[PDB]
Symmetry: C3
Subunit: 267 residues, 3 copies
Amino acid sequence: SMGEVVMSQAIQPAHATARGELSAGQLLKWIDTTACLAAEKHAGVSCVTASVDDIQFEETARVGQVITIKAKVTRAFSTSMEISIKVMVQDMLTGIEKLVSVAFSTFVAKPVGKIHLKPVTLLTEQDHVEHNLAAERRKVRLQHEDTRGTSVQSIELVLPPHANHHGNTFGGQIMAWMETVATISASRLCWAHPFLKSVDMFKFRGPSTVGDRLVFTAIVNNTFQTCVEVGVRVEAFDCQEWAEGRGRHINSAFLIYNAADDKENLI
Amino acid sequence: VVMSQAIQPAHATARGELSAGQLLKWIDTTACLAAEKHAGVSCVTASVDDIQFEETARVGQVITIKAKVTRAFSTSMEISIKVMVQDMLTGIEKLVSVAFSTFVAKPVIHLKPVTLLTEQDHVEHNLAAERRKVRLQHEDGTSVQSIELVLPPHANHHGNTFGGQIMAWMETVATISASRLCWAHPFLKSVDMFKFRGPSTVGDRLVFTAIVNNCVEVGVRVEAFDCQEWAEGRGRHINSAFLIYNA
Amino acid sequence: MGEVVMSQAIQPAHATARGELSAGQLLKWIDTTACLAAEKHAGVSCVTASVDDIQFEETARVGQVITIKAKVTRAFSTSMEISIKVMVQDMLTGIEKLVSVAFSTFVAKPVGKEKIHLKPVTLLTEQDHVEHNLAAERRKVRLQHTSVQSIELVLPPHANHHGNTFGGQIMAWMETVATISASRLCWAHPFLKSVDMFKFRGPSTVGDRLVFTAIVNNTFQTCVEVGVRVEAFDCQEWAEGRGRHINSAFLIYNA
Ligand SMILES: CC(C)(COP(=O)(O)OP(=O)(O)OC[C@H]1O[C@@H](n2cnc3c(N)ncnc32)[C@H](O)[C@@H]1OP(=O)(O)O)[C@@H](O)C(=O)NCCC(=O)NCCS
Ligand SMILES: CC(C)(COP(=O)(O)OP(=O)(O)OC[C@H]1O[C@@H](n2cnc3c(N)ncnc32)[C@H](O)[C@@H]1OP(=O)(O)O)[C@@H](O)C(=O)NCCC(=O)NCCS
Ligand SMILES: CC(C)(COP(=O)(O)OP(=O)(O)OC[C@H]1O[C@@H](n2cnc3c(N)ncnc32)[C@H](O)[C@@H]1OP(=O)(O)O)[C@H](O)C(=O)NCCC(=O)NCCS
């Protein structure tokens, strides 16, 4: 009733990892879908992931638990929108609901052919305060203007199910693909299976489309306490660019992984 | 038209049982491939009759599905569906479902009658008329909300959403509402007579809304939205459905 | 080098009842890395022409990582030979093993009514030259060379952006049907050991139905050979009966 889009996923073994936990990559993908739908409700046209803020993961959902994602447009700007993301997890046996993640993300309306956005409607006091908090967070976003022998290369062909019906590659899918490569790199240092704690704020620097090859390069970047930092770099190539060897930088993220809450589990 | 699929973790539920939605999907695909062998063109699910599951299938087992066109009408076709499960260590086979479905042809033309041969062929050919009569008569806890975005793999090559994809997404949300009643994990008993009352297409958003209605009965609502319609909040009602569970 | 490299973690979604990687998925992944290598050479869409002997010396498990390297060893005119290497690593132990060394052939598909002419492969190593030689001997060999029914509908993710059904996709559906037939003979879950050389005869396309039939062919005990047929139908072809022989393959399973 309040322009809040709601998803609900039960976690099958399909979404599961070697730990029986929900794949972090999948959560990222679901978060981006729900948020996009939130934006596309405000815009009327297709919207693409512009950037993500930092995401922290408080809990990881196990198989047999239900996840509930809620997204909302907090503020509309000129072509862009701030979308707020809440993520819960409910154990179907205990009844307990816990918070997984509060998160922010940015979407861009894509022109129909060859256009301005309406203002978001504010009813509550939370609406009016977050309306202002978005402009401060936006300053932070834009000012973010800064431009180990355990390497891992992967490659994914962008098929039609990985993109909207105009053919633009989904933000969430590149994030899902990133995360699995990152895990492979992080595991080269752990004696346990490590789980994702956070993704540092990053930007989608340019478009990707059906039939691109996305190349993922991952390396461990740092070690701290119980955790390990992995940089992933994403590059795009259409069929011709792929042969010539002149790709396009799509993004770079830093994912921080937790070695099962023990110092001993990493070298 | 025969389809055999083995049950793998990809298809399984939390307790290692083959997911009902996954079955419903495999039923439609096969029931659709039956219809498409008769019309020559693409076909879409018009309606579903009572489905009832006598057995639940488990990882490692194999499901065999048989579907055939009983009677072609003016633009629609009645299809029969048999569902067998086999154990690959026992050899034992068990019946999962006897179910009927109705498909409409979608030209971009008329349909010939089918080639009848058996005595049993004629019997189903006559009883289909009664069944079509019943199919047409349908004329009058906590709410679980979910949304799904229709991608290319969720539709035929012409862009039309599979009926079976909708029933699979329907089961996911219905199970959650059921689980939320008894604080446990249940299994699907049946799918009651409903009708898909409008098309759906790639790019649609399907909003699902499940509520506990009364052994439990989950009512699922499927509402469809353009990217434009999504903005204007005026969508299209695809279907309502009633699913019954035990725990 | 000139190597296309893919790394995949084996989740339960890629797995079987035991906790092993489905051979179907492995084959699909191998066809992709090889296809990516061909296209890096050709600069256009490439399809699977044929596959040599593939033998799996190990099976991987959930929570392990498969790494595939693919290289174009020689280009001819429309076709290229691709050398493939598959390794598996345990994510906890860190121990690696050879899964498979195999060979596949890819053909460059024209956009319009286009004549395609592939450039030579840049040779650097002495092993490069050795491989360029032995490619022709393998190319010559190539050109010289109870039961389960199933059906799959070709959708968008099963074909490249032009609409041509991937070789690896058919190769996946090809094992999932064979496994059941091998399960129907002896009452135990078996694992795939090798795939005998087979060619792709006709192209397939988005919207097709592929009908799969498999039978036990020959059983020298502790081994059961199972042949697979693959038959493709347009939507209209479907309703009339006349279809196309895509491929017939022989799979060796193990009890
Ligand atoms: C997002 C994108 C449009 C930014 O364009 P740009 O080169 O920065 O040019 P501009 O500065 O004019 O961007 C226009 C808008 O983007 C916003 N923007 C740019 N960088 C941003 C960031 N890091 N975070 C949030 N918003 C950002 C600007 O604030 C501006 O907003 P406004 O129109 O409401 O005033 C561009 O990088 C892009 O099209 N790539 C991602 C699209 C995509 O394909 N996403 C899926 C992943 S491949
Ligand atoms: C395989 C195919 C290319 C062979 O074509 P053809 O009818 O035999 O005609 P040609 O022999 O002239 O084919 C041209 C090339 O195919 C090669 N060829 C044919 N079968 C081959 C095989 N078994 N192994 C290696 N090369 C083969 C020839 O050597 C020739 O090579 P060149 O052009 O580099 O000199 C063709 O039948 C085809 O399009 N197959 C299906 C491809 C496909 O769609 N696969 C994806 C999954 S269905
Ligand atoms: C049935 C439908 C195809 C056409 O609308 P309609 O007004 O009900 O169609 P009509 O009754 O005028 O005629 C179409 C045929 O479908 C049959 N039909 C209509 N309602 C039916 C129902 N409740 N149950 C079974 N068959 C039904 C009719 O008997 C008629 O058969 P005929 O050609 O032999 O006379 C439907 O409303 C529709 O367009 N939705 C298609 C569903 C779809 O797109 N696929 C599923 C994913 S959304």
